[PDB]
């Protein structure tokens, strides 16, 4: 992913302020509420029957934190996203059979969450830089399908 130096600076500064205990769980929770077929992949999490049950589920919170960690790994390796996500791509494709469109959906839900947390600070140029990042992550996760 190519970011301009101004984009790289704005992306890094915002990311450093991300609440690590909330943002990931909220992005995953919203994926499960907004796109309910994604719940099929998380039957071991128990109760996901209502938005309140999803958002307060500790497995959603913990898994969401792992998902946030992987996006963070992407930001540390923007020049080698395919290589960084190789093992994750094999897991999601070959084992879980997650349709790649769902990767794009999660990336965009994460962008909605960053907007929700940062408000006016999540400006249209800041969003544009984050869209390049999440598209690169979704593409890297879908690489083993390609």
């Amino acid at each position: 992913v190519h970011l301009t130096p101004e984009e790289k600076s704005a992306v890094t500064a915002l990311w450093g302020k991300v609440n690590v205990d909330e943002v990931g769980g909220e992005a995953l929770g919203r994926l499960l509420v907004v796109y309910p077929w994604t719940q099929r992949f998380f039957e071991s999490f128990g109760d996901l029957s209502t938005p309140d049950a999803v958002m307060g589920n500790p497995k959603v919170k913990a898994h969401g934190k792992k998902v946030l960690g992987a996006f963070s790994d992407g930001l540390a390796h923007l020049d080698n996203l395919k290589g960084t996500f190789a093992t994750l791509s094999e897991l999601h494709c070959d084992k879980l059979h997650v349709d790649p469109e769902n990767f794009r959906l999660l990336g965009n839900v994460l962008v909605c969450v960053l907007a929700h947390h940062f408000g006016k600070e999540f400006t249209p140029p800041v969003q544009a830089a984050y869209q390049k990042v999440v598209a690169g992550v979704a593409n890297a996760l879908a690489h083993k399908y390609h």
Binding site: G29, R30, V33, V34, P51, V54, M55, N108, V111, C112, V113, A115, H116, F118, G119, K120, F122, P124, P125, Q127, A128, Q131
Partner: protein, 141 residues
């Protein structure tokens, strides 16, 4: 397909936008043009510079169409027939672009109305925007 709870959530959330409808419409377009530059190909005739009066004017038209869609949520094919003819027959907008604008509107609402943007409301608005998108991209005449 919208549930009765989705319709209530959309009416409440879109009602909270109120007087700012046009502002949110304009910001969603700006976010779309900057985040997904391919979308600019549909607007060669627009001044797309930041704070352009044309983008502000168009933003109000988009937002007003959405208000009209909410006001006729169970009769959208009939109420939006003229917009469907424009987007599907005349402009031939690729449906992917509707997903992009819908996402940018959700981002704008998440940034400016955080108290309203609950997971349940986010789900209802996403379904509403997808239903409006299906109507605008279909030829049903």
């Amino acid at each position: 397909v919208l549930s009765p709870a989705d319709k209530t959530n959309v009416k409440a959330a879109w009602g909270k936008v109120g007087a700012h409808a046009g502002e949110y419409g304009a910001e969603a377009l700006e976010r779309m043009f900057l985040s997904f530059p391919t979308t600019k190909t549909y607007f060669p005739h627009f001044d797309l510079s930041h704070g352009s009066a044309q983008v502000k004017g168009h933003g109000k038209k988009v937002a007003d169409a959405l208000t009209n869609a909410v006001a006729h949520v169970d009769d959208m094919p009939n109420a939006l027939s003229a917009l469907s003819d424009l987007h599907a027959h005349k402009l031939r907008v690729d449906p992917v672009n509707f997903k992009l604008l819908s996402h940018c509107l959700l981002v704008t609402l998440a940034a400016h109305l955080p108290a309203e943007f609950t997971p349940a409301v986010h789900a209802s608005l996403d379904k509403f925007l997808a239903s409006v998108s299906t109507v605008l991209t279909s030829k049903y005449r």
